[PDB]
């Protein structure tokens, strides 16, 4: 495997960079874009979360099936790119305006667009670039690394211009979409090893898919709902609130750089240890961050606990693909990824963010993070025995 003169490592490494630059404007700062610029209810954000969740649930199963049926022809990435070129006009001239007139129909329009391009589109891109990673002899983690930077780079640009011009970032995101098209243009890309839908749906009957989904629902989904309200919990440690955000801003921007660095070596790390132990290590880092937040009391301790995310992501993202390709027929890589790690997480996410949200109000943040911390730690150790692989003690 080579990287410097690997044309497609750069075309798709960059593709990760600019794609996640685009989504960086949308996702990490979505709550402030809604409440601060469009003056939207929090009554209504639950309607937006529901719309995206509902259309994501529909898109992600088909994205996986089409991803495998298409294999590497990359016809769907051409489609996603075309929709991201409207990133700016959609947010500025469609989503915002429509939601202020009537929120419910802005949520269907936004639920469809965002559920397509990001909630399902990002896993679909990752799944495709992983296939390319096997053909063009470069590790998937080394190309995904780029996305961490593009995500961080965009987080920096929006913080600087928040005071100046809020629309600038969205227009750049559209420009990034045309960068993606150019890269997609120049990226280079009777058989019963090919994808067949009939046998794709018999994946449900196998039990290692169920226990993989159990890990996703029990660990990854619990962790993702913990991170949804962690931003406000982070700033509550700061008396100033303006420095609470700016410290938050600094940790996300430069923390993502550490994420990329850990992910540079994560393929080599994960190749020697199991793909299973990569997930259990990821689940272990997940659980420690959650539980640690309930006992945290200090501004420093949560800067640490927010930096822990950067250690977890590389072993969960690189590890999950190593686990899927190792223990399932790799013609079903994308199907397995977008059904187990996306659809089931997104389905569980609906029910456990109401259970998470309802505990924040009954008991404290600390008590709430203690509960989820044990659900995540419990299902992480259940899967020390349940997932299929070497295991932790093989290394002693």
């Amino acid at each position, epitope marked *: 495997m080579y990287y410097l003169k690997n044309t497609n490592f750069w075309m798709f490494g960059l593709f990760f960079f600019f794609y996640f630059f685009i989504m960086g404007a949308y996702f990490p700062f979505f*709550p402030i874009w809604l409440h601060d610029i469009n003056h939207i209810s929090k009554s209504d954000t639950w309607i937006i979360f529901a719309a995206i969740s509902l259309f994501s649930l529909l898109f992600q199963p088909l994205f996986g099936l089409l991803s495998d049926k298409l294999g590497l022809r990359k016809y769907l990435l051409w489609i996603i790119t075309g929709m991201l070129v409207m990133f700016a006009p959609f947010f500025i001239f469609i989503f915002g305006p429509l939601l202020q007139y009537n929120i419910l129909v802005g949520s269907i329009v936004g639920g469809i667009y965002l559920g397509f391009c990001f909630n399902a589109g990002a896993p679909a891109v990752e799944a495709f670039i992983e296939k390319v990673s096997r053909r063009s002899n470069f590790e998937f983690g080394r190309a995904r690394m780029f996305g961490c930077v593009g995500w961080a780079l965009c987080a920096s640009i929006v913080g600087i211009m928040f005071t100046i011009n809020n629309q600038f970032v969205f227009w750049l995101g559209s420009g990034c979409a045309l960068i993606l098209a150019v890269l997609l243009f120049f990226a280079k890309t009777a058989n019963h090893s090919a994808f067949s839908l009939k046998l794709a749906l018999e994946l449900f009957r196998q039990p290692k898919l169920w226990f993989l989904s159990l890990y996703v629902i029990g660990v990854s989904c619990t962790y993702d709902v913990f991170d949804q309200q962690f931003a406000n919990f982070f*700033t509550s440690f700061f*008396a*100033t*609130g303006e420095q609470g955000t700016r410290v938050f801003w600094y940790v996300t921007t430069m923390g993502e750089l550490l994420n990329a660095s850990i992910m540079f070596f994560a393929p080599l790390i994960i190749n020697r240890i199991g793909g299973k132990n990569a997930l259990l290590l990821a689940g272990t880092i997940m659980s420690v961050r959650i539980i640690g937040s309930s006992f945290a*009391t200090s501004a420093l301790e949560v800067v640490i606990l927010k930096t822990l995310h950067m250690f977890e992501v590389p072993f969960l993202l690189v590890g999950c693909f190593k686990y899927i390709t190792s223990q399932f027929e790799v013609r079903f890589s994308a199907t397995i990824y977008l059904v187990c790690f996306c659809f089931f997480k997104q389905l569980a996410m609906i029910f456990m963010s109401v259970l998470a949200g309802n505990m924040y109000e009954s008991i404290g943040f600390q008590g709430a993070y203690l509960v989820l911390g044990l659900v995540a730690l419990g299902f992480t150790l259940i899967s020390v025995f349940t997932l299929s692989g070497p295991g932790p003690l093989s290394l002693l």
Partner: nanobody, 117 residues
Framework: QVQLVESGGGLVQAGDSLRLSCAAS????????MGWFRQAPGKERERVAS????????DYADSVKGRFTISRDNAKRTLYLQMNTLKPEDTAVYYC??????????WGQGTQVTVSS
């Protein structure tokens, strides 16, 4: 959602201390960083002091940076403002306020504080 009831205000002579309190009703007090604001006639509302949920960090305006002390008791869900060596300039309505993100998203009715020259 959250109710804040300020108490302890009054009228005092220049140089004396006065402690104010704020009753936190509703959602968990521990989940919110809080601050005190004041509003005098013919002047803009200013933040006097803020404090995180635990009490580990406190920020005071330079106008009262040395005199006032902001306290909280999350077991008793109350938020205090000790005010020492008060001056007639410090005569205003003092408000209790809860912070979510950067926005202070809940207020109390306020307690009037009057200082004689």
């Amino acid at each position: 959602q959250v109710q804040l009831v300020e108490s302890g205000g009054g009228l005092v002579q220049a140089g004396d201390s006065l402690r104010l309190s704020c009753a936190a009703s509703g959602r968990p007090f521990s989940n919110y960083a809080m601050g005190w604001f004041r509003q005098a006639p013919g002047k803009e509302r200013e933040r006097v002091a803020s404090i995180n949920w635990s009490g580990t960090d406190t920020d005071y305006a330079d106008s009262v940076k040395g005199r006032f002390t902001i306290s909280r008791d999350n077991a008793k869900r109350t938020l205090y403002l000790q005010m020492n060596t008060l001056k007639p300039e410090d005569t205003a309505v003092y408000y209790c306020a809860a912070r979510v993100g950067v926005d202070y998203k809940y207020w109390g009715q306020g307690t009037q504080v009057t200082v004689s020259s």
